[PDB]
Symmetry: C3
Subunit: 406 residues, 3 copies
């Protein structure tokens, strides 16, 4: 029948039950807790393995698919929508976190421009650049971690160039089309192992909770993120959809119910891409030419909930450490969180590796992620839902704004 989401629902309920029963009926040491969540670790190792070919091939094929005369218009209509919706999300998150109050920046601002143009393509696949001043002179070095931001820019430029070359460069277009669909097939292969991995990934996640006092203390912060996500998903996005196209926005969401449920269960926007494609094309009746570009490109660039969570978490951690923020310190968080959303891949544990940059932007230690790591999975489950909903709503907007070219 349809085991794609039934198996995942069974896995998540079994994971919750197993974690609760084990944590209570037993007292395991930290080493045994680490050994317990090994299958989830293997699932995460596979998901992180698949991202690089996925991102590179998806960007290249999405940009090169557009004809030379329409690449500018459709690309602009997509990028403007992405930037506007993410800025709205960041502003809403900052405003809400400031109102509720749950609790060397230039170097980090220039490091973002330095990482858009890496010095080496091979090294950018597994290493990232960072500079720190010392005596005052600037010293730069390469740390570990894939440089998604530079690879995305290079892939966009390469796709545009190959699309402009035409029949002479058609061989590269064919090569990257085949590579992208091979990567999609490999992701479909991983979806078989996904449920058993998710079971342990959540069971061992609800086991490390030492006393629930962490859950009580992280209260109010969790409400701020959930309220921001609800406002951005139920109010702002349907409103901007209705403004562009005069259609009932909620019928679109109801048609994208399967994709939303899959995203909320697996917490990965890149692995739910086929379901989103099917729901958008077969049900909502969206043109293929534009969705084939909006979906794969926006599955890792357009992440509104991720940006909102980055801004809210950064300001909350700052408030936990005092360090009253000025107006200028608000802005550097807003811009960095926008880059952090673009710099994170469609995998669960993403959004924590990219939060180090936004934390160091305002001069904070990298170890403060542990202040909120405890309950991050529950918020990730809801971040992914709005990350894919934004992509779906962008699809209808671009389609309505591209009627004259179809």
């Amino acid at each position: 029948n349809n085991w794609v989401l039934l198996s995942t629902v069974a896995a998540v309920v079994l994971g919750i039950t197993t974690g609760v029963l084990v944590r209570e009926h037993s007292n395991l040491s930290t080493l045994e807790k680490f050994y317990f969540a090994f299958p989830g670790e293997i699932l995460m190792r596979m998901l992180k393995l698949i991202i690089l070919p996925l991102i590179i091939s998806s960007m290249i094929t999405g940009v090169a698919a557009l004809d030379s005369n329409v690449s500018g218009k459709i690309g602009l209509r997509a990028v403007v929508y992405y930037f506007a919706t993410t800025l709205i999300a960041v502003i809403l998150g900052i405003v809400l976190v400031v109102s509720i109050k749950p609790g060397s920046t230039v170097d980090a601002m220039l490091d973002l421009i330095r990482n858009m143009f890496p010095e080496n393509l091979v090294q950018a696949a597994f290493q990232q650049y960072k500079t720190k001043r010392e005596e005052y002179k600037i010293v730069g070095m390469y740390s570990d971690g894939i440089n998604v931001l530079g690879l995305i820019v290079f892939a966009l430029v390469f796709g545009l160039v190959i699309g402009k070359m035409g029949e002479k460069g058609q061989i590269l277009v064919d090569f990257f089309n085949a590579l992208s669909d091979a990567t999609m097939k490999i992701v479909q292969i991983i979806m078989w192992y996904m449920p058993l991995g998710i079971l342990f990934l959540i069971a061992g996640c609800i086991i490390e909770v030492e006393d629930w006092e962490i859950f009580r203390k992280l209260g109010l912060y969790m409400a701020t993120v959930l309220t921001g996500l609800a406002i951005h998903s139920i109010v702002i996005l349907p409103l901007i959809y209705f403004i562009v196209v005069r259609k009932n926005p909620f019928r679109f969401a109801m048609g994208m119910a399967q994709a939303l449920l899959t995203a909320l269960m697996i917490s990965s926007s890149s692995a739910t891409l086929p379901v989103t494609f099917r729901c958008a094309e077969e049900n909502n009746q969206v043109d293929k030419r534009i969705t084939r570009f909006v979906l794969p490109v926006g599955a890792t660039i357009n992440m509104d909930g991720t940006a909102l969570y980055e801004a809210v978490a950064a300001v909350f951690i700052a408030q936990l450490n005092d360090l009253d923020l000025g107006i200028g310190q608000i802005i550097t968080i807003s811009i960095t969180a926008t880059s952090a959303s673009i710099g994170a891949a469609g995998v669960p544990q993403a959004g924590l590796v990219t939060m180090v940059i936004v934390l160091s932007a305002v001069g904070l230690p990298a170890e403060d992620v542990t202040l909120i790591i405890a309950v991050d999975c529950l918020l990730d489950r809801f971040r992914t839902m709005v990350n894919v909903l934004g992509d779906a709503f962008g699809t209808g907007i671009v389609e309505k704004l591209s009627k004259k070219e179809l």
Copy 2:
């Protein structure tokens, strides 16, 4: 005429003569000894350069060549034979080494599963993952050394996916076919320099022998390995060949005499692949469709003598250090040695870099390889012979077991 093996025989006899005459008539320092064996070092740098494209392209083309309906059957018939023959070799080696007696394991057991699914494809080409516990919590880091095990798994999955896609993904099949045959051409180019490199590689190998007391002390251990190789090559493999196909097993070996001699002289199963192909196809009259898959895939996965040597050497080093082994400690050696055979490339100095993992599995320092490094080349010369003989015997077995599909 036929200079492929005549030149190699001349090179090996000249190397033995040169090493003996130099070591005796002269007293060189360690720096001069290092400078003496420079051409062998260059040959090894070239052979290690060629392995990565060779392995990747060979696995991809071998798996994608099979049709979608026959890929499962032939692949299963090959992998079952590989696993069974290697397990037999490991068991025989362990039994012999235990009888003759010449003299934190869970982390190393899970590192093997962690290395089958690397977190990065580019980083897996030159780096490997390892975890060590410290206070107890697990800390992981990436050391140097190509991750052959993860690349093999990814290449197998990619080849299966591309074979299933068909005419749409035929461009990748063509690309990797061309890449594989280009790599074979480059290996044929290196075969010109091979003889002069081998001359110094053995001359400087028989020079570092300080007093022959090392040869006397390593006695009994060398007998255990040679007896195990002889038993596995003369008895077990012909018997399992005769059981499957009712033909004289020794006629097959006699037809593969040129390949066996080349493997025994150059000590590299990947560089003797064309000779093995020629001997199996032109003389033994083996079908091309199945040999084109069994030979290149099995030239680095199917290594029986390597696994036997790993097990015997690990147990011998353990006995030199006391540390009486339990039944459980025998098993972790057996499984790790099976992975070590798969994880080693078809190059001479391989089998020593992969022995560090099997030594650390039972909690031993990485510097104990020096206890047997002195006479390792002589045992490598015989390991390669049985490594290629196992591949040849597997070819006839799979062919006889694949008559109905040809």
Copy 3:
């Protein structure tokens, strides 16, 4: 109209004016000086990003374009001319620097052979090998920095192999042709940002001059380099051109005036390749089949002024530190400087990273590059001009020596 060089001339004059006016009218700290030259840093990050695909694809396509029967002859006629002209340049530089007098080698000599055959293709793209002796035994390790020398050799061998395979390996030829022209398109895209980057790259270069006493002290050394470049560009190259082909050498230079001006303004031989192509083909009326091979291959291998500058700077730094040089110490500089010219890419700051090897060849600290870093841009501007002039003159020589095969 023609904004390619008018904009660059405006940028260079504005950069000189801005640097002079700022350095005098203001007293900035070192951190502010570093922040001032940020756009030049971004331009350099982009230029260093583009070199690896450019080099690999250019070598592969240039070698594979030649037919199997003519690849040996044309390749030999090009490589002999390259080696002879570079040796002449090195000898002239050494002679001039010795006459004017402005002021563990075996390990560094064998490291060059070790770097021609790297142990890993992926690691060679961003790392380089070096050995140092310690107690005496040799210990080797990998430092950072792209290994251009090994990649060039592998690309040459791969191109020859693919050209010999023919229609069977034509898919790789097509792939690399498309990749090379895509890289050229990306370089043309970077040429838009080039002028604004050059403005700051020179403005902040003439700002770090502390007191002009450095300019006075570096006098005589600058004259030695300029005189060597003038002699090699005005006398030796036209003479060797006239000897081969009985045509007026200076008419060729006058036709290559646009390319020479572009090279002198942007100080990058790889980014001025399209202009050199246009000037050589449309004006000088050179056959396309031979220029398509001589230009892209020689744009990074044939660098005469770079080698002359390396030799002169190394001997000048040695004379600043006393350390009287023997005849043997002259030779190791000459051979290393020849490799340093081949090992440097067509980017401005190149020639300083490759000078560390030639400085360590004679046993000198790597920090002595700061003795001449102050005025290096002015000498680079003239190095690039002769680097492209040598390529142009080689084109006519090979064409005249290849009449019978066209």
